[PDB]
Amino acid sequence: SMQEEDTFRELRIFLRNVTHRLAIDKRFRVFTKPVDPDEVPDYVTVIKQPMDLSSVISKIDLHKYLTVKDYLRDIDLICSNALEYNPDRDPGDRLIRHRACALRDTAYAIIKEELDEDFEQLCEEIQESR
Ligand SMILES: CC(=O)c1csc(NC(=O)C2C[NH2+]C2)n1
């Protein structure tokens, strides 16, 4: 219905706004673009499902997210990929892991404060009806 299309459009506006606020944070720069195969050749072979904030924006615009739950699965993937690729005790790895957890924590905190629970429930019920 038109009301349901309006609901998903509001969802996309909300998700673009959250994603933009993450992408402009200097801490999260490393998560804003896919990994360069030239600088890091073994990334594509180690990380089977790469994810980054530019790809998240692309997926929003392709209508790939029908709920905030599905969006947070990709935020979680950005973070979990970073922890898996940088597991060592060296400061370079520890810095990226700290930033990855901060990205995840920040996304969840924005959503906890700004996502209306009844709006998410409506999205989920439309999704389940398709
Ligand atoms: C996106 C992501 O997780 C990523 C990009 S580079 C990297 N890790 C390194 O470059 C290692 C050298 N210090 C750690 N991780």
Curated annotation (Swiss-Prot):
Tissue-specific expression: Highly expressed in estrogen receptor positive breast tumors and in osteosarcoma tumors.
Lineage: superkingdom: Eukaryota
Compartment list: Nucleus
Listed transmembrane segments: none
Description of what induces expression: Up-regulated in breast, uterus, colon, ovary, and stomach tumors. Induced in breast cancer cells overexpressing NCOA3 or treated with estrogen. Down-regulated in 5-fluorouracil-resistant derivatives of the colon cancer cell line HCT 116.
Bromo domain ranges (all copies): 3-114
Coiled coil feature spans: 108-130
Family: Belongs to the AAA ATPase family.
Subunit structure: Interacts with ESR1 and NCOA3 and these interactions are enhanced by estradiol. Interacts with acetylated lysine residues on histone H1.4, H2A, H2B and H3 (in vitro).
Protein's job: May be a transcriptional coactivator of the nuclear receptor ESR1 required to induce the expression of a subset of estradiol target genes, such as CCND1, MYC and E2F1. May play a role in the recruitment or occupancy of CREBBP at some ESR1 target gene promoters. May be required for histone hyperacetylation. Involved in the estrogen-induced cell proliferation and cell cycle progression of breast cancer cells.
Record protein name field: ATPase family AAA domain-containing protein 2
Lineage: Eukaryota, Metazoa, Chordata, Craniata, Vertebrata
Gene (UniProt): ATAD2
Portion of the full sequence shown: 981 to 1108 of 1390
